[PDB]
Amino acid sequence: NLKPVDAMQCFDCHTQIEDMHTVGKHATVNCVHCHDATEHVETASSRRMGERPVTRMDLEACATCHTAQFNSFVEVRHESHPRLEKATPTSRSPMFDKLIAGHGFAFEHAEPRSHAFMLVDHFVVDRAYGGRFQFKNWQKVTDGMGAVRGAWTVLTDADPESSDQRRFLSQTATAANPVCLNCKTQDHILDWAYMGDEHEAAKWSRTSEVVEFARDLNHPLNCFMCHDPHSAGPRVVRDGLINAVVDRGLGTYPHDPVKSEQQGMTKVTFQRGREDFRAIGLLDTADSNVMCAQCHVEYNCNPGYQLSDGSRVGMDDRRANHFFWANVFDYKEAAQEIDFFDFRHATTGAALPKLQHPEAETFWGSVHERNGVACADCHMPKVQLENGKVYTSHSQRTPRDMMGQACLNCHAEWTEDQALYAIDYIKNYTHGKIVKSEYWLAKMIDLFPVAKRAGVSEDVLNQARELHYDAHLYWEWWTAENSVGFHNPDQARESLMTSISKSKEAVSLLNDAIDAQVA
Template sequence: MLKQRLAVAASIVGLGALLAIPSLAAPKAKPAAKPANDGREQCYMCHTEVKALKEASKHAALACSVCHDKTKEHLANPGPDTKPVTKLDPAVCGSCHKNQYQSFFTPHYPEGGSRKEKGVPTGRSPMQDKLLAGHGFTFEHAEPRGHAFMVVDQFAVDRFQGGRYQFKGGWKNYDKIGKTWDVLEDKGASAKLTETAMAGNPTCIQCKTSDLILKWKYLGEKGGKFDRTSNVNDVMKDVHNPVGCIECHDPHGTQPRVIRDALIAAIDKDPAKNIFAKNGKTDLKVVSFRDGFRKIGVMEKTDSRMMCAQCHVEYNCNPGTQWSDGKPVTFASDRTNHFPLKNAKEILAHYKQLDFFDFKHAVTGAR
């Protein structure tokens, strides 16, 4: 009994001492002070949409120069020739969010650190080559290794550009972490491995990285540095990072968001009747930048279904064929950057109404 009383007394004394230490006591939330004379008010004169996102947010105290280079030159002489450079390296976010950054770029062993094909006898779908007969995915469709590898795995797979892109130093470096072109090398346009496919296109690539967000106009239309019809190898050379934090977190205001254009277009087309709608409403505010050059979707509450559906969803990013007359559908059509947002029972009718199919089975002829 005496030991118990002493233990209780010690715990009370310890708790009091803990609360008396300023560094360990629970601090009262205080809004961060705004940096003085950082030029933001001049930025806001043009970028009103940024002000609406940023002010009163958790990032309100951050100066524009944290994420943008050459801001002084732009403020001194605003115009297209002095555009500030946006820092898209995830390491910028990692300078504050160290744990998230480190975990993102840490290989997961044994499952996520190895390359294993799905369509082999020991894989998860041994019949895959028959199910997808005639499709490029039958040329090495490997298990995912996590978001940090999504660009290098896309470029170094056998179905992509004939195996033109390989790991520097060979496959022993397949788990190396770093910028795309520090890890991979281009063997040249004449390089072609046997049993490979020439798949890959710009629409596909812009879904694997956040680097193209300012070079890709909404839905891949003409007007950006790259569009749906661009040469895929030219696009690749501008890709250095996988999808970053800005894919799901707005860097100005920290709100949860989505940036995948085809997803935003599908939801915006019918906010009351899509798979994310609740009570006839979807928690997604579409914000337009640079007179509609790009759009983002900002949420009031985090919806991981919508965030993950930027990639993990049925979509089309390929050319194809029209159901009605068999004519080809090229990248000139926005049907080559399309999210149906339909369930499995509705998907066939949806594509028939869209007058599009991207694949015909080599054995059965099914579309």
Template sequence: MGRKKTILLIAVLFLFAISGIYFTNADAQYKAAPAKKGVQAEKSVKADSCYGCHPVIKELHSSGKHSKNLCSNCHKELDKHLKAPGPDTRPVTDTSWEACGQCHKAQYESFMKEAYHRPARDEKSQLTNRAPNPFWDKLMAGHGFTKEHNLTRSHNWMLIDHLIVDRAYGGRFQGKNSWQYLFEKGKAWEVLKDNYPDVKEHKAFIPQSAAAANPVCLQCKSQDHILKWAYMGDPVEGARWSRTSNVVELVKDLQHGLNCFTCHDPHAAKPRIVRDGLIDALTRPDGDTLWHKDPKRTGIKVIDMGMRGFTRKIALLDKYDTRLQCGQCHVEYNCNPGTDTKTGEAVKMGDRRTNHFPYKDVFGLYEHYVNKVNFLDWKHALTGGLLWKAQHPESETFYNSKHAKAGVGCDSCHTPKAKDKKTGKVYTSHFAVTPRVQLKETCLKCHTKWTEEQARYAIDSIKAHIRGKMRKAEFWLSALIDKVVEGKKAGLAEDVIKQAQDQHLRAHILWEYWTAENSDGFHNPEMARESLTRSVDESMKGIKIINDAMAAKTSAK
């Protein structure tokens, strides 16, 4: 009998043990992120507690790899909100890199890695850079980018670099430790200071600077304010920030450069885009973008995330597509006021054209801006003609290139796969940098017969060829500008000057696109060569218009 009791006791204890293991594992499926050092641990909150009021989040969260993650991993101060849901008790959403880095450690560490292959504040207008002077300042006369226009630096510094550049905030923001800011990583306002904190006016404070930044510029620098910004930046009730906000006040609400959730949906753990201008372009009824014309285009699902009384959209992608994800920022878009080409009236930040993506290559931009959108950026200081200002159009340039058609993505060359030295797991490096820095992991993966020296030689040869074409385009643009000025001084008819100014605009677009595009044409050398040589042709046509009119005027005398 004693033996039977012993066996029964062991069986009962075994069942309790099994039950304990089961319930422990069940709870463990709801993964709590490790607490940060020095921060009081939040009370764990499971997703079921939030699903009732957030059906859209439920659909996303329950569909992906994050389905077992706790809401309290990324949302803090949930107790008050759960007890009394409403706008006054909204939880604090952690938009930091560390929020994702707690679990995605290898990706986080690679993202925070420094790129020292080129200096900071390396102006494109330097003699050996992409758009050297003396032509740059002449060809862009009257535009803020003549104050300072730099080559790129690491993603984690992009907000800081935007805040401190001379053309953006008039020099009001500087490093707390002077030039030591170059090495300091972290929240922007732990690194920088406002030298004029009591001045709310957005203006220039130091010589040869400009206050050209505006709220739309910041959409490509940070998404810290994603929950406070309505679709397209419309100034609507409930949205704290909009296209028309005081940008000096807005930037004080931002801390991080490129956020993880810009490309990765934190609820569904799926690829996405959040940039409203791109979503707007991809959903235009006329279907005129590169993406629309691509028979193999990646599908998107647009979702309205507006839970705060205003529309806010994201778009999930059917698969990872870096042309779209990187194309949220590495893209041509308008982000500033300008002039209506039909009426001649000012286009101000209240107009949606100040947050606009064409998503077309260089050959479609004249027609798009002049005849479809009726918008141009600024008036050239010497010719008086309206011109267009390019933003970094890498995505559109690469879209139909030979590399893209071969299945190469932005990630193949700039954020390749890497192996964790400790775990042996393969992950996507988030150290976004030129492939020249990591040739073995990029170029040589496909070009297996090349050496690193040969890969570097191929890159440099293509870039050298295109830079040569850029210099020729600049020479002829400069000559055209001189001719227009000469024609105006000579009193040529207004219609003649307008024709020449239009030729200037055409030639300018075909050239300046490549000063903003950050590969010296490497992303699509065939397109670059055609565009730049056509720029020369258009400049020559403009010069001929003035010369013919001058000859006719002389002959008439």
């Protein structure tokens, strides 16, 4: 059985923690629930850590007092099809392989599934670790609670004796790097300096051997990613988000300074050896828009190249951990701002961006966002009980599973079927435009080899490549974004029509140039 420790003894050295813990709703929660610090207390000084205390990062540290939220969180939505490749005619991006050629996502890009699996899915996806990590067997894919208990309880490593990224299976890639893990786990929260910069107190950084890092990580989406364990108050821990909102002064709602002020973030920094080490962002309100934006954003978490001169931008560069914090119509400018692109298209040779799940940036300015609605209202609503203590569902999933609470309490004018029909109108329309965008992209891409072989000039090809950047951006935003337009239907429509317009321009340019060479 746990035996409490004397927190006052801790607080003598840990004034920041004292200030947070004594005031919040965890003031009565003893440190022993999450820390084993006996040897630490014996050996620390005011400024030197001494022996490092043990800190529990497992979600069960919270589950003894908050079983309802834990059990809600670890639920597996079996209806969320697992390991479902997006580059198939029945998924999100029928022509993804042609359009993304040159990028690691060509090796595999599945639809998301339940949060319990985020870290294991990251480890096992074909594009990440060369097939090094796999489920112990194909039964383990169902085991959400097991994954939550720890990735290494359900996975194997093909070669525990080496730590290099390499291909173990032929059609894999080794795209994983340390930055990725920040959106899968925060087990490393005390072992990673802010932004993943080199730091004498950090075991891990952007430049670490990702296989070695992987082996030290266990738990998905720690409870403390949204809730400070000391104050129990709302927060974010993701460095890149803090950097965008606070360091770069963009605010929590870059389009709305008033809302940014009312629903702001306070950066709190923790030091090692009296040098800044790590940071968190305390929220003014329990704002799920910002909580979920720790991960559901477009980001850089990868090496790339400079737009200016094509030179490599490695993991050592700050730009390898970057939140653009820009909507689709501001993105190109945001990428120019850091002089960055992701890959060169294998066929066209165009410098291109790689977009990832920009839900937060897409939601900005939408009708729901303007009306004060937040991710949680649709995706993790309060539970409704005929008799009971209300709590907030932590099963982050489609509102289709809880339409009464997610939609119909607000939309009293609709039945469930009507609300569903409204969602599907938007998704069907948007998907059509995604498909048409891919048709036109593919038509353009296919003209590049013809043009090159017909002797069309580099100047014309470069003109077409410049158009490719935009055609790509204004399409891929929407295959990357998970709402199929629902989060911002008017923006999707404008973007996708822009994509098609750019592709059509490029197709005309290339056909005419080809036809002129033949003539």
